[PDB]
Amino acid sequence: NRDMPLDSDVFRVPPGYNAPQQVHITQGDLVGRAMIISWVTMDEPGSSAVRYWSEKNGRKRIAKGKMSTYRFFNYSSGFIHHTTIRKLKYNTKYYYEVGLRNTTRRFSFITPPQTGLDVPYTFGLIGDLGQSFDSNTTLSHYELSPKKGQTVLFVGDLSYADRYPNHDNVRWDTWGRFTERSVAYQPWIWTAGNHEIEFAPEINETEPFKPFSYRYHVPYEASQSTSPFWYSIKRASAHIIVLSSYSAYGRGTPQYTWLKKELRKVKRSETPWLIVLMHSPLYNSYNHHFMEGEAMRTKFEAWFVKYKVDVVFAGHVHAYERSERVSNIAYKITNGLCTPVKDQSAPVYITIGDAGNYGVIDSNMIQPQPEYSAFREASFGHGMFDIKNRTHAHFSWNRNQDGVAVEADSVWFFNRHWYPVDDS
Amino acid sequence: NKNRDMPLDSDVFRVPPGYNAPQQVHITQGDLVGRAMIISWVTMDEPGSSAVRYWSEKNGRKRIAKGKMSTYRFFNYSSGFIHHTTIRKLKYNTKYYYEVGLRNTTRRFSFITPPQTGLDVPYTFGLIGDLGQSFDSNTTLSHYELSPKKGQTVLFVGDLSYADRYPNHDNVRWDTWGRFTERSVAYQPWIWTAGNHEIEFAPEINETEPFKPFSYRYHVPYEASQSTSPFWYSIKRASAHIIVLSSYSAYGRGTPQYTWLKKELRKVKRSETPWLIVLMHSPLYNSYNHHFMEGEAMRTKFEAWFVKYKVDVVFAGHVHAYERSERVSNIAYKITNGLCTPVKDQSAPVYITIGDAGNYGVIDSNMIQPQPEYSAFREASFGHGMFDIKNRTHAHFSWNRNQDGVAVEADSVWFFNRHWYPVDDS
Amino acid sequence: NRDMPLDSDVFRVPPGYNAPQQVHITQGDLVGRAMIISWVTMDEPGSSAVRYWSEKNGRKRIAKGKMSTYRFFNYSSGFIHHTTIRKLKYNTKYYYEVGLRNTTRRFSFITPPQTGLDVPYTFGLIGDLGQSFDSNTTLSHYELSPKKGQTVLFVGDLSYADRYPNHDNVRWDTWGRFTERSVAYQPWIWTAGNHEIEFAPEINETEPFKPFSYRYHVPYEASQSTSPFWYSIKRASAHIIVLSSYSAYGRGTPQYTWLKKELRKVKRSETPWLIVLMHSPLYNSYNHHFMEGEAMRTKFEAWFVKYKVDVVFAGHVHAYERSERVSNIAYKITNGLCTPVKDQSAPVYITIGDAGNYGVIDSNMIQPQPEYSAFREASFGHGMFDIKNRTHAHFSWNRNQDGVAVEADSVWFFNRHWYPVDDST
Amino acid sequence: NRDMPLDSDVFRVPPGYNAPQQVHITQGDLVGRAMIISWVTMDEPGSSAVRYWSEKNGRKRIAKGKMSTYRFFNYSSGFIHHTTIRKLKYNTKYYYEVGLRNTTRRFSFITPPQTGLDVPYTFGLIGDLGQSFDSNTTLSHYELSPKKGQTVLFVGDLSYADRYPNHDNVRWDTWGRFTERSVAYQPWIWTAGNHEIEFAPEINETEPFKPFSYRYHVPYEASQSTSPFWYSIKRASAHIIVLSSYSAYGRGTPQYTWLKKELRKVKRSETPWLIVLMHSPLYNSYNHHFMEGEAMRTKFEAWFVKYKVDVVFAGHVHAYERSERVSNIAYKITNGLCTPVKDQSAPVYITIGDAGNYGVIDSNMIQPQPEYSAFREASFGHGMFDIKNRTHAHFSWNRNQDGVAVEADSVWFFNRHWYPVDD
Ligand SMILES: *[C@@H]1O[C@H](CO)[C@@H](O[C@@H]2O[C@H](CO)[C@@H](O[C@@H]3O[C@H](CO[C@H]4O[C@H](CO)[C@@H](O)[C@H](O)[C@@H]4O)[C@@H](O)[C@H](O[C@H]4O[C@H](CO)[C@@H](O)[C@H](O)[C@@H]4O)[C@@H]3O)[C@H](O)[C@H]2NC(C)=O)[C@H](O[C@@H]2O[C@@H](C)[C@@H](O)[C@@H](O)[C@@H]2O)[C@H]1NC(C)=O
Ligand SMILES: *[C@@H]1O[C@H](CO)[C@@H](O[C@@H]2O[C@H](CO)[C@@H](O[C@@H]3O[C@H](CO)[C@@H](O)[C@H](O)[C@@H]3O)[C@H](O)[C@H]2NC(C)=O)[C@H](O[C@@H]2O[C@@H](C)[C@@H](O)[C@@H](O)[C@@H]2O)[C@H]1NC(C)=O
Ligand SMILES: *[C@@H]1O[C@H](CO)[C@@H](O[C@@H]2O[C@H](CO)[C@@H](O[C@@H]3O[C@H](CO)[C@@H](O)[C@H](O)[C@@H]3O)[C@H](O)[C@H]2NC(C)=O)[C@H](O[C@@H]2O[C@@H](C)[C@@H](O)[C@@H](O)[C@@H]2O)[C@H]1NC(C)=O
Ligand SMILES: *[C@@H]1O[C@H](CO)[C@@H](O[C@@H]2O[C@H](CO)[C@@H](O[C@@H]3O[C@H](CO)[C@@H](O)[C@H](O)[C@@H]3O)[C@H](O)[C@H]2NC(C)=O)[C@H](O)[C@H]1NC(C)=O
Ligand SMILES: *[C@@H]1O[C@H](CO)[C@@H](O[C@@H]2O[C@H](CO)[C@@H](O)[C@H](O)[C@H]2NC(C)=O)[C@H](O[C@@H]2O[C@@H](C)[C@@H](O)[C@@H](O)[C@@H]2O)[C@H]1NC(C)=O
Ligand SMILES: *[C@@H]1O[C@H](CO)[C@@H](O[C@@H]2O[C@H](CO)[C@@H](O)[C@H](O)[C@H]2NC(C)=O)[C@H](O[C@@H]2O[C@@H](C)[C@@H](O)[C@@H](O)[C@@H]2O)[C@H]1NC(C)=O
Ligand SMILES: *[C@@H]1O[C@H](CO)[C@@H](O)[C@H](O)[C@H]1NC(C)=O
Ligand SMILES: *[C@@H]1O[C@H](CO)[C@@H](O)[C@H](O)[C@H]1NC(C)=O
Ligand SMILES: *[C@@H]1O[C@H](CO)[C@@H](O)[C@H](O)[C@H]1NC(C)=O
Ligand SMILES: [Cl-]
Ligand SMILES: [Fe+3]
Ligand SMILES: [Fe+3]
Ligand SMILES: [Fe+3]
Ligand SMILES: [Fe+3]
Ligand code: NA
Ligand code: NA
Ligand code: NA
Ligand code: NA
Ligand code: NA
Ligand SMILES: [Zn+2]
Ligand SMILES: [Zn+2]
Ligand SMILES: [Zn+2]
Ligand SMILES: [Zn+2]
Known part of the structure; x- marks a missing residue:
């Protein structure tokens, strides 16, 4: 009935070979110094590494994560990546990048203040x-x-x-x-x-x-x-x-x-x-x-x-x-x-x-x-x-x-x- | 006094004698309508066979069913060797004998299938x-x-x-x-x-x-x-x-x-x-x-x-x-x-x-x-x-x-x- | 490069929804009384059941098998079926069928004589x-x-x-x-x-x-x-x-x-x-x-x-x-x-x-x-x-x-x- | 038969509740800055953590490892631990300790010189x-x-x-x-x-x-x-x-x-x-x-x-x-x-x-x-x-x-x- 059709603009595929898509983050620890970074690659497994750095310090670090797949009936998932960035500073804007092997995409988040x-x-x-x-x-x-x-x-x-x-x-x-x-x-x-x-x-x-x-x-x-x-x-x-x-x-x-x-x-x-x-x-x-x-x-x-x-x-x-x-x-x-x-x-x-x-x-x-x-x-x-x-x-x-x-x-x-x- | 559990040396807890004798034998219905029986037992000395030999009193034809062995650990406990074997296609309202431990020490038991529903x-x-x-x-x-x-x-x-x-x-x-x-x-x-x-x-x-x-x-x-x-x-x-x-x-x-x-x-x-x-x-x-x-x-x-x-x-x-x-x-x-x-x-x-x-x-x-x-x-x-x-x-x-x-x-x-x-x- | 191209007649897909393809058999036991039946379905898992009967007698029976899948890099296989028919008579032509839930395909084989x-x-x-x-x-x-x-x-x-x-x-x-x-x-x-x-x-x-x-x-x-x-x-x-x-x-x-x-x-x-x-x-x-x-x-x-x-x-x-x-x-x-x-x-x-x-x-x-x-x-x-x-x-x-x-x-x-x-010589 | 009998002194069990036994080490990386530390506990799983520090400087660090078990016929293993200590300094004597939850046992090794x-x-x-x-x-x-x-x-x-x-x-x-x-x-x-x-x-x-x-x-x-x-x-x-x-x-x-x-x-x-x-x-x-x-x-x-x-x-x-x-x-x-x-x-x-x-x-x-x-x-x-x-x-x-x-x-x-x- 009212579901948006597959060709809608909100469903567009990020371009470029094996570009990360379906990127999403959530809190990765108890108190907010960590972030789970998640995304999907469709053309091949790719790497689970996340490059990240704060706007202030500017020192770029690599966090390593894991890739998984699943099937459901006749469906086969793409390659799912989950990676936790840790020991972040509070109240700080960070950039992060995924897709480090072929098509990199950049995003950012702002850590919460300390509890x-x-x-x-x-x-x-x-x-x-x-x-x-x-x-x-x-x-x-x-x-x-x-x-x-x-x-x-x-x-x-x-x-x-x-x-x-x-x-x-x-x-x-x-x-x-x-x-x-x-x-x-x-x-x-x-x-x-x-x-x-x-x-x-x-x-x-x-x-x-x-x-x-x-x-x-x-x-x-x-x-x-x-x-x-x-x-x-x-x-x-x-x-x-x-x-x-x-x-x-x-x-x-x-x-x-x-x-x-x-x-x-x-x-x-x-x-x-x-x-x-x-x-x-x-x-x-x-x-x-x-x-x-x-x-x-x-x-x-x-x-x-x-x-x-x-x-x-x-x-x-x-x-x-x-x-x-x-x-x-x-x-x-x-x-x-x-x-x-x-x-x-x-x-x-x-x-x-x-x-x-x-x-x-x-x-x-x-x-x-x-x-x-x-x-x-x-x-x-x-x-x-x-x-x-x-x-x-x-x-x-x-x-x-x-x-x-x-x-x-x-x-x-x-x-x-x-x-x-x-x-x- | 406070503890009313039966002590480990109680007669009800005795180990059946003989090398790798089956113990803890138990059965339950193994299908929807009563024509099957799950036969379960533990061997303690070595894995042993999961085969069950069984026959009805009425026909006296010995048959063999094959099952599976499994183990588990819980903290620092290691189980013995757990056997589950399903006997299938039993006749209704019929007395059956069955035997476990076919390799070393055999033990025989019996049950009676229910009538048809x-x-x-x-x-x-x-x-x-x-x-x-x-x-x-x-x-x-x-x-x-x-x-x-x-x-x-x-x-x-x-x-x-x-x-x-x-x-x-x-x-x-x-x-x-x-x-x-x-x-x-x-x-x-x-x-x-x-x-x-x-x-x-x-x-x-x-x-x-x-x-x-x-x-x-x-x-x-x-x-x-x-x-x-x-x-x-x-x-x-x-x-x-x-x-x-x-x-x-x-x-x-x-x-x-x-x-x-x-x-x-x-x-x-x-x-x-x-x-x-x-x-x-x-x-x-x-x-x-x-x-x-x-x-x-x-x-x-x-x-x-x-x-x-x-x-x-x-x-x-x-x-x-x-x-x-x-x-x-x-x-x-x-x-x-x-x-x-x-x-x-x-x-x-x-x-x-x-x-x-x-x-x-x-x-x-x-x-x-x-x-x-x-x-x-x-x-x-x-x-x-x-x-x-x-x-x-x-x-x-x-x-x-x-x-x-x-x-x-x-x-x-x-x-x-x-x-x-x-x-x-x- | 002399490999046959993908659109060659030899590579055609059997028609019909979830039709078995890549059907293949091999001996399923030590002496020839059994046959492993194998095939792939591409549209959905399907049934691993095989219907079979001898050409002269004709009592149609069902053998049940297993489905498996695998991945290789960015390839995902279809649904692979292996099913063993056992206790066949020697020197006998048998028909067998696969794809029992949607598009059925029938084949035949002749068991070897007794050794x-x-x-x-x-x-x-x-x-x-x-x-x-x-x-x-x-x-x-x-x-x-x-x-x-x-x-x-x-x-x-x-x-x-x-x-x-x-x-x-x-x-x-x-x-x-x-x-x-x-x-x-x-x-x-x-x-x-x-x-x-x-x-x-x-x-x-x-x-x-x-x-x-x-x-x-x-x-x-x-x-x-x-x-x-x-x-x-x-x-x-x-x-x-x-x-x-x-x-x-x-x-x-x-x-x-x-x-x-x-x-x-x-x-x-x-x-x-x-x-x-x-x-x-x-x-x-x-x-x-x-x-x-x-x-x-x-x-x-x-x-x-x-x-x-x-x-x-x-x-x-x-x-x-x-x-x-x-x-x-x-x-x-x-x-x-x-x-x-x-x-x-x-x-x-x-x-x-x-x-x-x-x-x-x-x-x-x-x-x-x-x-x-x-x-x-x-x-x-x-x-x-x-x-x-x-x-x-x-x-x-x-x-x-x-x-x-x-x-x-x-x-x-x-x-x-x-x-x-x-x-x- | 010339195998040593089970009560030989070489086979004595280290005393204490869940004391690590069968402790053994091997090189843990390609060039010698790491060590795989291995040992068995018999009374319960215990911790796979290894405490270690160089004898001179002395800052005590912890490495986390993994526990595993296996069966063979009617044998069930004790709890096997493998833990890699990494990023060690070359040509340096280190102490390490296993069995941190109940009975601790202390050993030492010397990292090789750099290749x-x-x-x-x-x-x-x-x-x-x-x-x-x-x-x-x-x-x-x-x-x-x-x-x-x-x-x-x-x-x-x-x-x-x-x-x-x-x-x-x-x-x-x-x-x-x-x-x-x-x-x-x-x-x-x-x-x-x-x-x-x-x-x-x-x-x-x-x-x-x-x-x-x-x-x-x-x-x-x-x-x-x-x-x-x-x-x-x-x-x-x-x-x-x-x-x-x-x-x-x-x-x-x-x-x-x-x-x-x-x-x-x-x-x-x-x-x-x-x-x-x-x-x-x-x-x-x-x-x-x-x-x-x-x-x-x-x-x-x-x-x-x-x-x-x-x-x-x-x-x-x-x-x-x-x-x-x-x-x-x-x-x-x-x-x-x-x-x-x-x-x-x-x-x-x-x-x-x-x-x-x-x-x-x-x-x-x-x-x-x-x-x-x-x-x-x-x-x-x-x-x-x-x-x-x-x-x-x-x-x-x-x-x-x-x-x-x-x-x-x-x-x-x-x-x-x-x-x-x-x-
Ligand atoms: C489904 O199961 C239920 C439960 O079993 C059945 O209900 C029972 O039915 C039996 C009959 O089959 C009842 O037993 C009978 O009871 C009478 C009455 O006894 C009372 O009164 C007597 C004086 O009149 C006294 O002597 C006695 O001590 C008691 O206080 C008995 O007289 C009778 O015994 C005589 O008849 C039998 C049959 O020929 C002889 O063999 C004896 O030697 C005696 O000469 C007999 O014992 C029983 O009381 C019922 N139980 C309950 C809890 O109701 C049910 O049967 C059906 O329902 C009952 C109520 C009756 O209508 C049955 O006729 C009817 O079939 C079962 N349903 C079906 C469809 O079978
Ligand atoms: C075991 O199997 C071999 C191979 O088939 C048999 O040898 C073959 O026997 C055939 C006869 O049944 C031969 O064919 C005949 O040849 C003659 C001469 O030209 C023709 O006139 C005639 O019309 C047939 O075509 C065939 O040549 C022969 N093959 C070879 C490679 O030798 C063998 O049979 C036994 O051995 C041969 C040598 C003959 O003595 C047969 O009579 C004999 O039975 C088979 N063994 C048995 C026990 O049957
Ligand atoms: C599984 O783990 C439990 C918990 O540790 C083991 O039970 C403990 O065994 C200890 C022996 O190593 C007991 O300590 C001793 O008690 C005696 C008698 O009071 C003292 O003389 C002695 O100095 C020690 O303090 C401890 O009491 C016991 N703990 C509990 C909560 O029961 C268990 O061991 C098994 O059971 C006990 C009763 C002993 O017989 C052990 O030899 C036996 O292996 C562990 N089970 C297994 C299968 O490893
Ligand atoms: C599994 O990974 C392989 C390896 O990348 C995939 O094959 C490759 O697919 C890309 C397209 O995403 C091809 O690149 C394109 O080539 C055309 C023709 O020259 C060009 O016009 C485009 O601009 C683009 O560069 C690449 O050639 C191809 N490599 C091969 C086939 O060897 C493959 O599709 C993946 N399979 C699955 C099931 O995902
Ligand atoms: C927590 O935030 C509240 C919402 O801003 C504060 O209430 C607001 O305080 C303003 C200035 O104090 C005042 O102009 C607003 O009308 C008022 N808003 C409401 C909905 O009450 C609150 O300030 C304290 O509590 C109020 C009730 C006053 O008594 C203030 O004087 C207090 O400082 C803040 N509370 C704290 C503990 O900071
Ligand atoms: C590598 O170690 C070798 C073993 O010590 C050296 O050979 C020894 O050199 C001694 C001089 O330091 C000399 O007294 C010994 O006779 C000799 N031992 C043997 C078994 O030959 C070796 O020294 C070089 O090679 C020898 C053959 C002599 O020509 C020495 O003068 C050389 O320095 C050491 N090589 C190097 C490159 O250091
Ligand atoms: C979804 O909303 C965004 C922002 O309001 C808009 O630009 C876009 O066109 C919408 N897409 C669809 C399919 O409604
Ligand atoms: C393969 O061989 C068959 C039988 O000779 C022939 O009918 C078919 O056209 C061939 N296909 C090719 C060469 O692609
Ligand atoms: C093994 O060798 C050591 C060192 O020589 C000795 O002290 C010990 O008694 C020996 N044990 C046996 C069982 O031979
Ligand atoms: Cl409740
Ligand atoms: Fe809802
Ligand atoms: Fe209760
Ligand atoms: Fe070749
Ligand atoms: Fe040797
Ligand atoms: Na309640
Ligand atoms: Na509910
Ligand atoms: Na029987
Ligand atoms: Na070779
Ligand atoms: Na050899
Ligand atoms: Zn809901
Ligand atoms: Zn309860
Ligand atoms: Zn070759
Ligand atoms: Zn050798």
């Missing part, structure tokens, strides 16, 4: 991007934001290649080339959504998350996680926890065990902003995917309140919603306590899965609007979480049909540790 | 959970094997050896458990469910593959029901369709297990197997203090499916005690409508917790008071269950306590089939 | 085939031969894909489509030559024989070999031993150990004809590859004499040569005994690497023709080893430039065990 | 060592040599564990503990002999060299080899080429292809001494294994003459032999040129497989002694290749029945590139 209590930083929020014309408009709006996002928190559902026949993994390549104009210059922090599962036993593809996991690496060992699908990083004044809605989280499982330990490592005097990313929302008053989040909610919601998470970001529902600060953790089967109540130790739950997908919005809502829902609207767009300091962060939502500087919704987050005031 | 085929299933290797465990197993109801197959709802309570999960305690349970499971299949003591996720000793020792030692015929994982699968046996679930695997919407179960419930034909039985480790209904509400997560996913498909019974363990629910459901909840109380629902399964076979000697006696309406009967005693199918409409469940005689049932109830005879059996 | 002393059987001899116009002519001559070859003994150097840039493995696919018109209907017995090594560290391909070994499977475990590159089969009245010139054969290595035990298992009272295949010739009087066979000769020649091997076939030299029965096994470094002498207990050594390759013949011969060389000529062509009974086999060599019925060289073999009499 | 034309260096030659009482004597004689060996060139046949029932791989562990008293302190340069093949299809062990290759790593990638069984290193003024008698070496095979290119890289103005190690001798006048080396000789002898190899060392024959400088490379099947002739561009071929094995010597010799044989004797012992400078190196053979300072055979090597005097 600290009072360190401003602006996060973009994008979920369920896809590669429709709507997707392209959302990305344009983010790039043109006057607030200037410095990192994208991506709440999952990347390419939607699995909607195509045999999950036509070409649509992973096109999505890589489409997003390069943003993610080659600033990290995107990856969350796994249901369109990344790609469980297709009918064509003998039964390894969950396979194409996504080959194409997008994350620094999961840096937080002592055993799986790429849940992990944490710190960046500026934020501690960001990424969870996997489609992995196990029963008591005693790896993800549950890891998250319980991870929450104990949080130090709000170093990173006052505690942020959780997951694909499927625990609070959601849209009909589509209603109550799908209940299972994870039974395991994790009380932990979020106990540790005073500031905000939880999710996607999956193709629309926008912002909850009140509520909790629904008092239920004991026979005591009848199953209704959410205002709770100032609880996070705000934000659904931001509306960046475009394959061109369809979720407009059917549960009626009436429940007390726990502060704002909801079925429009395309993206968010910005703008940390001013340890007490204040400004969240805004920009609609695709508005000007790039118009915020149809916006709210001040008051920090749950340093300033726990009603921000209704 | 069918509407009115009687069959008696044992129910054992959280068995362990304490003296209480030995007593439960004795009561099972001395039962005049005579179980023909054990439905085992998880937590096997409890080896993971030992330092570095001392996998020697898996070997002892295998030698101990052999006197039953070498002669009749046990249907394996994975419990939380099978997870053995221990990153501090760089052992991060969930279920590894369990999965090397206990194979299941999971491909036969088009499952992609040993931890959830289905078998049919006599008049029963048995669905085994994994509490400690993913079951979110779109995951392999969730996808497999949705499809498997639509393949169920109650005109062929009228008794629909679900095994899982962690109970969805549980009024004991220990592990209270741990099953809530899977309940939000699957309970409505069990009601829609009129599951007859759900068996679970994990709680070290016995409980039998009423037929109830709690599937009307919509966040803001306040409908969170379980109600009687004749379309729902009975939920039975039967994790009381012994573990490491500890019973769970703290119950939430008063007994809730959804709970029909509960008791903190060691024992085992029996699910005795008479025909498409009637099955008789009974619970036997270790402190009673082997022929005494302390709880019992008639199941009226939800598909063929849905009359009120409360 | 016996006097069982006639006609073996083709083809080496260093390649895909030039000369290659196509040789294959044409073989398939039109009035002698009617029933199984090809192939002494190595298949596709010559490794002469292309990055070994362009597309030229393995084309060769499979070209050869199918013969090897889909009768087994070819595969020997690994030096163009199969494909050792290319400069493009990080360091696994020897990788493309060859993915595409061409052999029944090596049936003779207790641990490697596909050396193995043994029996067919009709012949015991055939296949060796790897480019694998280790020092004392104590797998191949040396295996050959030693295998020769002990030979029973000439059951299979009278003992035949060795290897790529590199032990006896070779051409300048090209002169004396490359010496290393293996020092290890195995004395064994071939001890066990009275009837014939040894090799390729590698792009020409034809037939030796006298000779041996060179008395050398002791300082005793001066280094000349081949006549030896009635030795095999005849035949170089038959002249099926066409990429169109070049090896014409530089060392002069004069040495006493050990009975006949040699630098012409393209192929051979036929035509077994008549336990005492007599007729060998003939047919040149591409002659008519298909013209034997330019021809000799009767007297079996070294059952008719140990001088058969020299 | 160069006139750098002196003393190499021990040991072959077919084994773990018999003769083996212990040879190793004692080597340790006590007044010439002071600084690196051992080991021409193969290590533990002889494969003579035991099911190749009882415990006899690899005992050999590792026995040789530690030398190889933990100076590199041994490993060659693979026939007792390392361990190809045993009758007990379903069909991977050649499996136990050896898990236990003893070599820096084969540093010379662009694709296999651990052939490689080259440079140390001081020597270029050392290690070949594999029981791998493939036909034309076009990886080993053949590698050797041809490696010989092209030798620069005799940087390393004047060109040394080849292989297990099976190309020249051998003993009855045992006579002419087993002919196959490799047909492929590589002409290359050795063409590139003027100084010396070729081999083992396999359980005895000592030293050849004249000869070549036998003119044979063309019919031309009758099959007798070795004096050739001053050819190497000397030395058989030194007499360090003890399991207690048997090879005494039956071809009679009369052929002209290509300069000296031969069936006694246990070891050799020393003592490089003085670019022109002169002194080779000596010490018998176990003699005093540790007595040379029963002794010859000057005159360098084939800088001083090709008739020797």
